[PDB]
Design a protein around this ligand. Structure first.
Ligand SMILES: CNC(=O)c1ccc(N2CCN(Cc3ccc4nc(C)c(=O)[nH]c4c3F)CC2)c(F)n1
Length: 350
């Protein structure tokens, strides 16, 4: 049996759960008989993205529902759905392409998780928790409850939960200090860049085996750039509740996972509305989606020379913006250095 700390053991079990991976596929209405977890491949996912891009071209160029029908069916051919003998819903709008682009992104992390678990060696004498921990190539340590870093992290959670996200409260169960193999060396050209912030990135439990082994990744080139508000980058938030909404927890599964990453923002390209960009303008290193609300800038604290925006939510002064809260997007995977992973219990008020 494993010598790993009990919170680390429970984390590994959580993220390598096969039935959670299956429950996530069922949520997307995928036919598991026509295509199980083991049939999932990058090749198929990329072909599905490419057809979604063709659907996107047909919708933006204003094709008829009779004309797009052919392209909508082509997607359902690559990613089988569970509708029985009924006709699938027509993908004739941007919301539909956005929803399908989002599902595919998630399937890309699920495929990594299942590949990791089904790859490798079988040894009965070794605890499967120890076996599955090594697959991640990440040093995972438990942060001491009474430490300074734990106090700062708990204040960030406590102070940046938005009023509009009050249908639930957050309880920090565990704090993990994480170190992905090779990530620190990848980050080096951006290590002393200006505008380095410790930001949130929430995701489903089924994404975290992929996130810890491959890191936060940008949607592939086949993916429709219009399926994402600020194009194809890595999205972060300064409001814990904005990111915790990406955990997709419920009364039937109230345990979520959220990251704290050091993001080299550099010169921010400030936007109030959707801009489906492929490349940043010269001199810019990130995109900042300007929210109506911002954590109080005079309340910013420093944790290992990185700015921590743990202030309470105040008005930014920004008018006529499409965002309630800020968002930060980087278009180079090297600009992210994962620092912490938090296990949270969501206490629903509904
Ligand atoms: C070659 N590419 C890959 O292998 C690959 C693997 C996974 C990918 N996804 C998984 C779904 N995820 C969803 C998502 C989106 C936005 C979020 N914005 C905030 C503030 C937050 O807090 N969370 C968010 C969020 F979770 C995005 C990244 C991906 F795009 N690509």
């Amino acid at each position: 049996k494993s010598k790993l700390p009990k919170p680390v053991q429970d984390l590994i079990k959580m993220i390598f759960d096969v039935e959670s991976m299956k429950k996530a596929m069922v949520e997307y209405e995928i036919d598991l008989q026509k295509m199980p977890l083991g049939k999932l491949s990058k090749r198929q996912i990329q072909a599905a993205y490419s057809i979604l891009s063709e659907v996107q071209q047909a919708v933006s160029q204003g094709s008829s529902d009779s004309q797009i029908l052919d392209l909508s069916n082509r997607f359902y051919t690559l990613i089988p759905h569970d509708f029985g003998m009924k006709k699938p819903p027509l993908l004739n709008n941007a919301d539909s392409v956005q929803a399908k682009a989002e599902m595919l992104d998630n399937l890309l992390d699920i495929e990594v998780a299942y590949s990791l678990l089904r790859g490798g060696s079988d040894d009965s004498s070794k605890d499967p928790i120890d076996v599955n921990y090594e697959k991640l190539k990440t040093d995972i340590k438990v942060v001491d409850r009474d430490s300074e870093e734990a106090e700062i992290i708990r204040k960030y959670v406590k102070n940046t939960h938005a009023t509009t996200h009050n249908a639930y409260d957050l309880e920090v169960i565990d704090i993990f200090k994480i170190e992905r193999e090779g990530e620190c060396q990848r980050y080096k050209p951006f290590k002393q860049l200006h505008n380095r912030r410790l930001l949130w990135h929430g995701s489903r439990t089924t994404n975290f085996a992929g996130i810890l082994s491959q890191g936060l990744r940008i949607a592939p080139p086949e993916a429709p750039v219009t399926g994402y508000m600020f194009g194809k980058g890595i999205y972060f938030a300064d409001m814990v509740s904005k990111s915790a909404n990406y955990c997709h927890t419920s009364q039937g599964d109230p345990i979520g996972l959220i990251l704290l990453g050091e993001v080299a923002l550099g010169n921010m390209y400030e936007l109030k509305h959707a801009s489906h960009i492929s490349k940043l303008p010269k001199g810019k290193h990130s995109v900042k989606g300007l929210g109506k609300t911002t954590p109080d800038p005079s309340a910013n604290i420093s944790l290992d020379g990185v700015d921590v925006p743990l202030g309470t939510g105040i008005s930014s002064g920004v008018n006529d913006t499409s965002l309630l809260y800020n968002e930060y997007i980087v278009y180079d995977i090297a600009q992210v250095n994962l620092k912490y992973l938090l296990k949270l219990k969501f206490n629903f008020k509904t």
